[PDB]
Structure formats: C-alpha cells, structure tokens
Amino acid sequence: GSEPAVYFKEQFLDGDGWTSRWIESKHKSDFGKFVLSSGKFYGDEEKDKGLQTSQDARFYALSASFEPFSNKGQTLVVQFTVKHEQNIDCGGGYVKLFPNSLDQTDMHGDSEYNIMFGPDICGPGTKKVHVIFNYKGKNVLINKDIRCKDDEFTHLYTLIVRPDNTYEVKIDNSQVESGSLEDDWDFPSIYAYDNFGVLGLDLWQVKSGTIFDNFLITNDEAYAEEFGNETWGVTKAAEKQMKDKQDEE
Ligand SMILES: [Ca+2]
C-alpha cells in the first residue's frame, strides 16, 4: 500500500527457523558451529535467543543473504547486539556486509566485503570497534580509536553512514564517535556501494560463547534507534538483575 526500508532483520524468534536463512561456509571443513541460545543469564529467555559461538579456538563463517540494495543517495544503518557472556579473552564480534556476488558456501576471511563493523577483542591491547570501508581494492580502517565493551553483558552496536559522507558510531544507543569519511579514513561517492546482498559473521575466537542478536540493516536512523530500544533496551535491566542474582549465589 501507499516508510523506513528494512533491508534485513534477524531476531531468532522462530526457534530452529533461522537454519533456512543462514548458510554455513564450506570453505574450510573445520569452522566452528553457531548454536541458538540465550545463554546462562538473560533479559528474557525467548527474546534473548541469538547465535552463540560454541567451539573454542575456531574460525566462524555463517552468513545471511537478503534482497540486494544500494545505499546511493540514502543513509545506511547496520546494527546488532553482541554479548560476550564468556568473559572473552580474544575474539571477534563484528559483521561484514558483502555484495550479492558473494558465494555464501565459500565465504572466508579473504572474501571481498563492502563494509566491516563491530568490536574486536584480543587481550588488553585490543578492545576496539572496527569501521572498515572497502575502497578502490583496499580495506581502509578508521583512524580513530573507538573503545569497545568487554564485559559479559549485551551491547548494541550501530554504524550510521550518511550520503553527505558523514558517519556516526553508537554503543548502547548513545553516540561514541562521529566525523567525516574524508577526515577519518585515508581514502563524494566514497560512502556508496552498488550492491549489498549478504551479512556475514566471519571471525575467530579463542574463548567462545559470544551471542549475536537483533540484526538490522535499514535506511533510517530514527527507526534503528527505536528498534535498538525495542531490543537491547528491553534486554538491559533484566539481564543485569539476573546476573546479579547469580553472582550472589
Ligand atoms: Ca533474539
């Protein structure tokens, strides 16, 4: 009939239903398995179900395709929650947005993506939020140091990329970094990609147990903020109260 474009959304609300929407890469025969779980403590046992890394010291390669789109002349928002319930030592917690040309059964560390975004932890020296744009054959990393969350709780990560070559990074629905694409990377069409068609979780973990949930790819900042409050905002207080109840035990 005669609104925000929701290019991709995943909340894992239909039990085993997610297996049809996500594809495991067969590039290697030893990739780790994601399992559906809400972990040992949660805000809501059912709502907080997400994809959890289940095997230590493994590479992960799982991806979801969606009807392809271009962000040309549009704002692009990529958002998701990451919960390092295990008290992570070293491991990725970022997503990669690929063009539709990706063969999902062959996705691996070298697969050509458009944008990579999210937290990476590797001991005390790396607690950072990556913001990477693939530009003219190179993966260009942000020149700002954005500290990521390293506790056991669910955190919302949001990247906003605007058609005026500006961006914003939010953690828990609050701005943590912003600036211009020309200023914050060493590169007017910089922001735009002809095609996005796959969101991938392509990463390494030593201590596994991270849970990913509430993925959203949209062209509207205000909608991503509302969805953020409907997901992460609903989890927050009750999840903390449950862990506090358990810590005392
Ligand atoms: Ca969920």
Author numbering: 12 to 13, 18 to 202, 303 to 364
Question: What's the publication's text?
Answer:
shown to play a key role in the MHC class I assembly pathway. cellular processes with broad patho-physiological implications.
to two different crystal forms in our study. yielded similar structures, except for their N-terminal extension. end of α3 between different molecules of the first crystal form. interactions were observed in the first crystal form. mode observed in the first crystal form.
